[PDB]
């Protein structure tokens, strides 16, 4: 309701699922959307198209706030990782910053064991 005209789009794109969250510049979240909510399940929810429709759904959700400017923070090794950005541009926000925020450790915790499939 409190119009701010500038948001931050956090795109957490894992291999399985993509979560897009629009928030204020300070950190308070406004709206979110996911491929699971978009209806795709499993092999279809791990596709760029699902990420695009989730981004569109999130943009519609936060439409009430009337945000115009939008800085993008993309995180995680996700299948789409880009379709969300294209969807936001299509939805009609001025993309200000495109930033990668993937958390890379400096040889920290040990990862899980390799899968034998």
């Amino acid at each position: 309701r409190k119009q701010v005209s500038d948001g931050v789009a956090h795109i957490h794109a894992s291999f399985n699922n993509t979560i897009v969250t629009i928030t204020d510049r300070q950190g308070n979240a406004l709206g979110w959307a996911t491929a699971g909510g978009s209806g795709f399940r499993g092999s279809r929810k791990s596709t760029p198209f699902a990420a695009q429709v989730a981004a569109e759904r999130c943009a519609d959700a936060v439409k009430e706030y009337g945000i115009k400017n939008l800085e993008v923070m993309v995180k995680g090794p996700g299948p789409g990782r880009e379709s969300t950005i294209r969807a936001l541009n299509a939805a009609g926000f001025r993309i200000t910053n495109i930033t990668d925020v993937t958390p890379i450790p400096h040889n920290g915790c040990r990862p899980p064991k390799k899968r034998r499939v």
Partner: protein, 70 residues
């Protein structure tokens, strides 16, 4: 890989620039290699094998570049 849209810069150009920056950084390769724990033996073996492969083909090219193809 921070990217800020330049003045009078098209969005498609900016997006391609961002992909180029990510490629140069090598983010996807790093996270993918860090997805699972590679044993030190496996890592050393893989590195040594790659070096041997690279060196072998260098010698092969530098030698077989003095032959009659036809």
């Amino acid at each position: 890989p921070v990217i800020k849209v330049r003045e009078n810069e098209p969005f498609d150009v900016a997006l391609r620039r961002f992909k180029r920056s990510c490629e140069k950084a090598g983010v996807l390769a790093e996270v993918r290699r860090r997805e699972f724990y590679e044993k030190p033996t496996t890592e050393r073996k893989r590195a040594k094998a790659s070096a041997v492969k690279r060196h072998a083909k260098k010698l092969a090219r530098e030698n077989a570049r003095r032959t009659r193809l036809y």
